[PDB]
Amino acid sequence: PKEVIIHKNLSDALKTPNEVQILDLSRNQLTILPKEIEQLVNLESLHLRDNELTTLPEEIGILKNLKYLDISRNQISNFPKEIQKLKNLEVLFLNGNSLSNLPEEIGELEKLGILYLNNNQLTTLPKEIGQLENLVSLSLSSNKLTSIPDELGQLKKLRILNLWDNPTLTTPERNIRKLFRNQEITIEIS
């Protein structure tokens, strides 16, 4: 049973916490996500787009059923290690944030299939990015990339790698393509 009338208010969601499948707090001028989010144990989708967040509380790791997390258009610069507990996460929108580095824990999102990192200030990816075995689409457009780790070549299900608008990346196109020599993939390099 899917939720079609989604929840848009945290206080109301907390009145019947086991009931809530989708919570949308986008454009709520949040500077912090309240710790009480951990009460929504059955949450599957959390939208926090266009807030003023700089991180997530460590309580996020209690949301083990989460499949979709939209934190786009915030000022996110770091994550708690507890993000590694989001083992059911399939889609992560991190576009439009303040990321200059991704933590090693990003590589622990075992079921992640789609990762959007457009419009951040990343200079590289951690070696642990190669642990995302189910990743199909990785978008890194408009970042500050200077290198791509060889471990990216471990992503055998990757079908789209988008590197548009990274003029700082001096890495030759042939070297990038060589990481995925045999594999079915389209690589977008400006």
| 73 touches Cl ion by CB under 5 A | no
User: Under the rule (CB under 5 A), what is the footprint of Zn ion?
Assistant: 47, 49, 58, 70, 80-82, 188
Binding mask 29-68 for Cl ion (x = CB under 5 A): ------------------x-x-------------------
Site for Cl ion (CB under 5 A): which residue of 3, 26, 59, 133? Answer: 26
Residue placing its CB nearer to Zn ion in the complex, 49 or 144: 49
Span of 22-30, 98-106, 119-127, 142-150 interacting with Cl ion by CB under 5 A: 22-30
Nearest distance from C-beta of residue 43 to Cl ion, angstroms: 14
Could you tell which of Zn ion, Cl ion, none binds residue 58, using a CB distance below 5 to 8 A set by kind?
Zn ion
| 85 touches Cl ion by CB under 5 A | no
Nearest distance from C-beta of residue 72 to Zn ion, angstroms: 7
Give the whole-angstrom CA distance, residue 128 versus residue 152: 9
**Interacting residues toward Cl ion by CB under 5 A:** 26, 47, 49
